[PDB]
Design an enzyme around this catalytic site. Structure first.
Site, PDB file in Angstrom:
ATOM      1  N   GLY C   9       0.942  -1.232   0.157  1.00  9.39           N
ATOM      2  CA  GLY C   9      -0.090  -0.269  -0.017  1.00  9.39           C
ATOM      3  C   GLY C   9       0.822   1.176   0.073  1.00  9.39           C
ATOM      4  CG  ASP C 116      -7.739   5.321   3.906  1.00  6.86           C
ATOM      5  OD1 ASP C 116      -8.062   5.119   2.871  1.00  6.86           O
ATOM      6  OD2 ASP C 116      -6.864   4.835   4.366  1.00  6.86           O
ATOM      7  CG  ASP C 117      -6.086  10.585   2.494  1.00  4.02           C
ATOM      8  OD1 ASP C 117      -6.602  11.681   2.209  1.00  4.02           O
ATOM      9  OD2 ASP C 117      -5.065  10.423   2.605  1.00  4.02           O
ATOM     10  CE1 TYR C 161      -5.714   6.398   9.615  1.00  4.75           C
ATOM     11  CE2 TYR C 161      -7.369   6.656   8.172  1.00  4.75           C
ATOM     12  CZ  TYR C 161      -6.354   6.902   8.714  1.00  4.75           C
ATOM     13  OH  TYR C 161      -5.372   8.168   8.203  1.00  4.75           O
ATOM     14  CG  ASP C 227       0.591   4.217   6.673  1.00  6.21           C
ATOM     15  OD1 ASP C 227       1.486   4.395   7.526  1.00  6.21           O
ATOM     16  OD2 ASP C 227      -0.643   3.903   6.765  1.00  6.21           O
TER      17      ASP C 227
END
Ligand SMILES: O=c1ccn([C@@H]2O[C@H](COP(=O)(O)OP(=O)(O)O)[C@@H](O)[C@H]2O)c(=O)[nH]1
Lengths: 175, 337, 335
Positions: C9, C116-117, C161, C227
């Protein structure tokens, strides 16, 4: 008073959290930023500020991803680029930190503190392109912040690694 | 005001030795060297010992005694000598010869990470070699170890002048930070040096970070902001350094340790005669002998590294502050205590 | 089946077959059961999940599903719709479903929808027809879940999260409450500790999040992950749980860093010590030597020095008051 009057006022939360950060106490400031964000999803400024705090007590690069959130909500907000680049340079990942500084500066042509920080990072990686003019412009802007006489752009530690007057660095240390 | 700290946690550097170099008899000390606290204990285990006194300017006086830390124990080559040479070539970590543990410096961390950083003393006999960091075994190696940011175009032009004017030389750089090395490279050839004239090595734990300084000949120093800790590291290994004090405190710092070294010749008043001193050292090919021998000799006798005198003097200064202030006397320039 | 694996990721174009191949070998030969693809270097398809795969990258996906086949590690594809999606356009739902079918008959059997994001500015019509982001999101989530025949493994990345985003606290999160309620255990939620730097000290926090999400959460193990931080490494043995966390978790999904084999040894210490910390330190010492990948004599960059500190900016906003907007009129009000 504003909050008890208007228990959904976002900007009031923002300012209150700002002063609480000025008050040094953070838990309540962090909570106020959180509630302000809840009451207003797109308040990228509150992201910027809450990340400022959230690394201010001690780094959680959750502050970094918060900066990224603020970025992507509106990319025109140069300050978030500056902050995330600062976090990167804190981590030591100098190149892309330089890239983000360089971005943020080109978004808003005149941004003093970001530009001087970028200059420090560049001089770290020894990029002597535009050397003399970089020196002279940073001297100009630090002088400007010195007779307008609040907070100098250059950090005191970086200061003496530049050709600035002993009066200038004395003033910066005093400030 | 700058304390010597390396006298305590790195006592193994107090001695020095080399095996017989492949060069025919000649003493090029700083290519492959021997160090360690038990190195003296290894003198008996040498099947053939060679001792020559380090002939500093005494004139047969003051030096004809033992002065074991002030001579050269060099071992004429043996089969075991080639074994440890090709050790460092191929790189087995360490072995034991006659009960004495010989270890290559470049991997001493695997002996003890706790001893790697300098918290614990590298505990056995340590051998180092110039080639293990790719260095020309038969050249003139100037060195510098500070962070890369304390270098500017003007200083780079300085050392480019020194390097051109001494062609058979290489300059020791550090990829510290790693990324800026190509950035300075482009500046290096852009004013006309090939990609062979400077050799840049990786970051290491302190103990190696300062041990590798021995293999260099003379340390070049950054006038923009001298190396505060790094310069003193270079001193403790015995390698000299030459600087031009500027005007900022840091610019003045490098000269302070050299004044405590008691030899002004390594301190420069202007850029050109700084060039002159650097090149005189790199070209004399005898003056290195005097300077390095004397630095090695009186570095321990230098008032810097021994913390006794500094401790008592600072305590006396504390006496001065309290016996000034406590009498109501206002703060002032507290001079010549 | 306890989920434990690596996520691609982070940065990176889908690399050579050899690097990923060594990755999968270290997965299978050292009991790593989980592997993901959702790189931030998803060229353009992270936002254009709408975009169809050319047979070229589809064939590299054939290569990937292949590798996940001979090395048997369950590959899971996962893409982020919440950036350019609308929850009232079932045509676009069909777009997602066709993409899933493409990559599913491509061999993939498990999926996560990365919420997310995401954008936070949904269509007003959506706002009244769908109460909050959570409700519409989990609605389409269960829709996909049923659509794929209730896949046994179906991961999920929520919008919130972390401790920062569980507004204002986990116990008082309406979003998370709705996520727990409207979800079925056939979908496995991800969550990264009470702090983004998931120094997982609180077991009770794990219990609270578990009960408010009505399942054992899955830890998107990003403590190593670039990340949010690459240099943030466990110098000592790996941590981030206790023994009692074993039933309370369903998966650990880590994102490695440039010290590739260091990540490998950390995750295999986690795998073994899963089925006590200092032996992992012993294995850290053991598999550091067996690594010999990027030793740097322990002394890669980030060596101590006399560093300064950064400086950061912020301002204060003013406010306005809106005036009257009424616009009405009558004709005969008199007598
Ligand atoms: O490869 C390296 C580079 C630096 N250092 C250490 O890093 C410091 C030098 O950096 P800093 O700028 O903080 O100190 P200064 O150079 O200002 O004296 C000293 O302690 C060195 O021993 C080291 O051990 N190895």
């Amino acid at each position: 008073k504003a909050l008890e009057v208007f228990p959904e006022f976002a900007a009031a939360h923002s300012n209150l959290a700002s002063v609480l950060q000025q008050q040094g106490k953070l838990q309540e400031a962090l909570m106020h930023y959180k509630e302000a964000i809840r009451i207003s999803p797109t308040f990228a400024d509150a992201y910027s500020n809450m990340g400022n705090t959230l690394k201010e007590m001690q780094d959680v690069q959750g502050a970094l991803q918060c900066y990224t959130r603020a970025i992507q909500i509106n990319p025109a907000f140069a300050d978030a680029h500056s902050n995330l680049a600062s976090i990167h340079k804190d981590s030591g990942n100098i190149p892309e930190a330089i890239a983000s500084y360089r971005t943020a500066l080109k978004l808003k042509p005149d941004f003093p503190d970001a530009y001087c920080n970028l200059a420090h990072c560049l001089q770290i990686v020894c990029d002597w392109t535009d050397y003399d003019e970089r020196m002279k412009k940073l001297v100009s802007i630090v002088a400007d912040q010195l007779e307008k006489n609040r907070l100098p752009s250059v950090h005191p530690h970086h200061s003496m690694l530049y050709p600035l007057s002993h009066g200038f660095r004395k003033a910066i240390a005093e400030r | 005001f700058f304390i010597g700290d390396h006298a305590n946690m790195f006592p193994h550097l107090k001695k020095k030795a080399v095996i017989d170099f492949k060069s025919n008899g000649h003493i090029y000390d700083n290519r492959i060297v021997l160090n360690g606290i038990d190195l003296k204990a290894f003198l008996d285990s040498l099947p053939d010992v060679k001792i020559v006194k380090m002939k500093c300017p005494d004139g047969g006086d003051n030096a004809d005694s033992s002065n074991t830390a002030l001579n050269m124990p060099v071992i004429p080559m043996n089969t075991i000598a080639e074994a440890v040479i090709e050790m460092i070539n191929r790189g087995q970590i360490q072995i034991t010869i006659n009960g004495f543990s010989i270890s290559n410096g470049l991997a001493t961390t695997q002996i003890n990470n706790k001893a790697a950083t300098g918290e614990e003393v590298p505990r056995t006999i340590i051998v180092t070699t110039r080639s293990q960091y790719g260095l020309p075994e038969d050249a003139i190696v100037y060195c510098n170890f500070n962070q890369l940011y304390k270098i500017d175009p003007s200083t780079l032009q300085m050392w480019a002048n020194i390097l051109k004017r001494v062609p058979n030389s290489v300059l020791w750089l550090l990829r510290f930070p790693a990324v800026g090395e190509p950035n300075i490279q482009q500046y290096a050839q852009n004013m006309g040096l090939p990609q062979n004239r400077i050799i840049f090595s990786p970051v290491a734990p302190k103990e190696e970070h300062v041990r590798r300084g021995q293999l260099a000949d003379v340390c070049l120093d950054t006038p923009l902001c001298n190396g505060h800790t790094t310069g003193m590291d270079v001193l403790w290994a015995g390698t000299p350094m030459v600087t031009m004090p500027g005007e900022t405190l840091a610019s003045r710092v490098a000269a302070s340790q050299l004044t405590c070294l008691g030899c002004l010749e390594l301190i420069a008043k202007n850029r050109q005669e700084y060039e002159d001193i650097a090149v005189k050292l790199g070209t004399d090919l005898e003056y290195l002998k005097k300077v390095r021998g004397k630095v090695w000799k009186q570095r321990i006798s230098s008032p810097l590294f021994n913390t006794k005198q500094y401790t008592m003097e600072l305590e006396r200064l504390y006496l001065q502050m309290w016996e000034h202030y406590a009498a109501g006397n206002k703060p002032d320039h507290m001079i010549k205590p | 089946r306890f989920l434990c694996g690596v996520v691609e990721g982070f940065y990176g174009r889908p690399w050579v077959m050899e690097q990923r191949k060594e990755l999968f070998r270290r997965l299978q030969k050292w009991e790593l059961n989980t592997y993901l693809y959702a790189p931030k270097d998803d060229y353009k398809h992270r936002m254009f999940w709408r975009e169809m795969y050319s047979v070229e990258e589809a064939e590299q996906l054939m290569t990937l599903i292949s590798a996940a086949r001979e090395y048997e590690i369950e590959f899971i594809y996962a893409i982020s719709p919440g950036l350019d999606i609308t929850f009232s356009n079932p045509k676009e739902v069909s777009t997602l479903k066709r993409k899933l079918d493409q990559v599913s008959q491509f061999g993939c059997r498990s999926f996560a929808l990365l919420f997310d994001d995401i954008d936070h500015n949904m269509c007003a019509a959506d706002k009244e027809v769908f109460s909050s982001f959570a409700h519409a999101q989990v609605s389409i989530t269960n829709e996909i879940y049923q659509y794929l025949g209730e896949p046994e493994t179906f991961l999920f990345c929520p919008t919130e999260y972390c401790g920062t985003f569980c507004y204002p606290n986990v116990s008082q999160s309406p979003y998370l409450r709705t996520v727990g309620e409207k979800l079925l255990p056939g979908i496995e939620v991800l969550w990264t500790g009470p702090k983004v730097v998931s120094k997982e000290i609180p077991v009770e926090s794990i219990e609270e999040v578990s009960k408010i999400i009505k399942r054992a959460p899955v830890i998107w193990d990003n403590i190593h992950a670039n990340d949010y931080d690459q240099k943030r490494l466990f110098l000592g043995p790996y941590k981030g749980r206790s023994t009692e966390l074993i039933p309370r978790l369903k998966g650990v999904l880590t994102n490695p860093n440039c010290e590739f084999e260091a990540n490998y040894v950390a995750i295999h210490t986690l795998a073994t010590w899963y089925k006590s910390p200092q032996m992992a330190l012993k294995l850290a010492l053991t598999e550091w030597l067996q690594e010999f990948g990027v030793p740097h004599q322990y002394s890669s960059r980030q060596v101590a020095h006399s560093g300064a500190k950064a400086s950061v900016v912020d301002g204060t906003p003013l406010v306005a008051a809106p005036s009257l907007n009424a616009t009405t009129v009558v004709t005969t009000v008199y007598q």
